[PDB]
Amino acid sequence: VPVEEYLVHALQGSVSSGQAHSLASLAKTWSDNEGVLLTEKLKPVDYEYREEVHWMTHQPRVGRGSFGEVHRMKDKQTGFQCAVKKVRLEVFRVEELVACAGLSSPRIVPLYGAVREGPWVNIFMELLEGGSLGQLIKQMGCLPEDRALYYLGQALEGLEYLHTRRILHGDVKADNVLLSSDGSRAALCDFGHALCLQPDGLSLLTGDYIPGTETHMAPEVVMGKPCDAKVDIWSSCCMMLHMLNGCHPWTQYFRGPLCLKIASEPPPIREIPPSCAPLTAQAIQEGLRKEPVHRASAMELRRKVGKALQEVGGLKSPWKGEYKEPR
Numbered sequence: 001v002p003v004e005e006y007l008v009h010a011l012q013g014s015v016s017s018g019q020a021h022s023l024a025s026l027a028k029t030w031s032d033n034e035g036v037l038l039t040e041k042l043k044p045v046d047y048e049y050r051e052e053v054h055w056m057t058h059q060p061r062v063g064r065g066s067f068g069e070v071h072r073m074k075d076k077q078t079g080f081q082c083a084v085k086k087v088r089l090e091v092f093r094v095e096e097l098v099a100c101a102g103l104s105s106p107r108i109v110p111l112y113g114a115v116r117e118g119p120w121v122n123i124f125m126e127l128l129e130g131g132s133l134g135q136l137i138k139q140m141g142c143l144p145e146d147r148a149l150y151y152l153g154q155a156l157e158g159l160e161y162l163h164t165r166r167i168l169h170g171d172v173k174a175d176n177v178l179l180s181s182d183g184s185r186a187a188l189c190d191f192g193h194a195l196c197l198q199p200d201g202l203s204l205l206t207g208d209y210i211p212g213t214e215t216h217m218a219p220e221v222v223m224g225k226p227c228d229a230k231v232d233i234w235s236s237c238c239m240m241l242h243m244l245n246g247c248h249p250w251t252q253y254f255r256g257p258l259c260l261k262i263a264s265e266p267p268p269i270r271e272i273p274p275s276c277a278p279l280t281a282q283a284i285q286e287g288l289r290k291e292p293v294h295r296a297s298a299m300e301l302r303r304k305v306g307k308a309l310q311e312v313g314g315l316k317s318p319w320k321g322e323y324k325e326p327r
């Protein structure tokens with residue numbers, strides 16, 4: 001599409017306020033200061049939006065996310081607080097912005113814009129004051145069954161929304177589910193591993209791709225086989241096990257590579273706690289089928305998990321409350 005050219009050149013070299021579609025087109029050229037901000041509350045100043053000039057990170061800089069790359073920040077002009085994820089330009093994948101720009105769902109963290117500055121791509125988004133589901137598991141040890149189901153339910157609604165639009169999330173895990181301040185709303189974040197799937201519907205380990213979290217990789221990812229939206233379902237069920245047990249599946253002592261065991265061993269259904277209700281155990285098993293064609297889709301599993309939650313009397317347990325011992 002060469003008539004983008006003229007629009008994209010107008011965007012280049014500048015930070016502007018604009019719409020999602022413009023950000024996506026600019027981001028395709030990211031393989032000094034430029035980008036698009038999608039909300040009123042972040043404003044460029046004279047064609048620029050520069051760290052520690054127009055926006056500032058919180059003063060004791062601590063960092064969340066796997067690489068401590070996510071920070072709380074404040075626009076200096078407006079005072080509005082939000083989150084920024086820093087990504088190294090040389091590793092930036094176009095899909096991180098092309099897949100999520102223009103999505104609108106309460107199960108997906110809102111994108112506020114992205115700005116390139118030197119060797120950084122700064123991705124701005126809503127600051128969810130409840131923190132991540134990963135932080136919650138760490139803080140509480142492990143989650144009771146009803147709360148685990150509730151959050152898996154919401155993640156699956158997010159995945160239905162993405163899969164319907166031919167978007168594979170690619171790193172579904174507790175760390176990438178963010179929570180409102182009261183714990184009642186969960187939403188998917190981090191599209192660094194996302195992939196746009198073909199019309200047909202249904203490769204991964206080729207070209208510019210960056211693999212997800214290893215303990216959560218489906219067998220077909222690890223075997224180099226063709227990959228589709230079912231990869232996310234496997235991955236969400238490894239998250240469920242993490243919620244219930246307080247640790248990732250496949251964690252336990254062994255030397256040598258874990259990717260071999262995921263290929264060769266049976267699925268980690270033995271880690272399902274014996275005290276789970278039967279529909280909870282059944283659902284996790286249907287999401288953890290080794291062959292993607294035998295695995296539940298997002299829609300199917302979402303219905304089942306909603307039923308499982310009703311089967312245990314609905315969401316009753318406290319938001320935070322009491323430490324539960326893992327293992």
Ligand SMILES: NC(=O)c1ccc2c(n1)-c1sccc1CCO2
Pocket residue numbers: 064065066070083085109125126127128129131132175176178189190
């Ligand atoms: N936006 C927030 O409030 C927020 C808080 C904590 C986070 C994150 N986001 C993100 S964004 C992309 C990845 C991650 C990893 C989890 O750490």
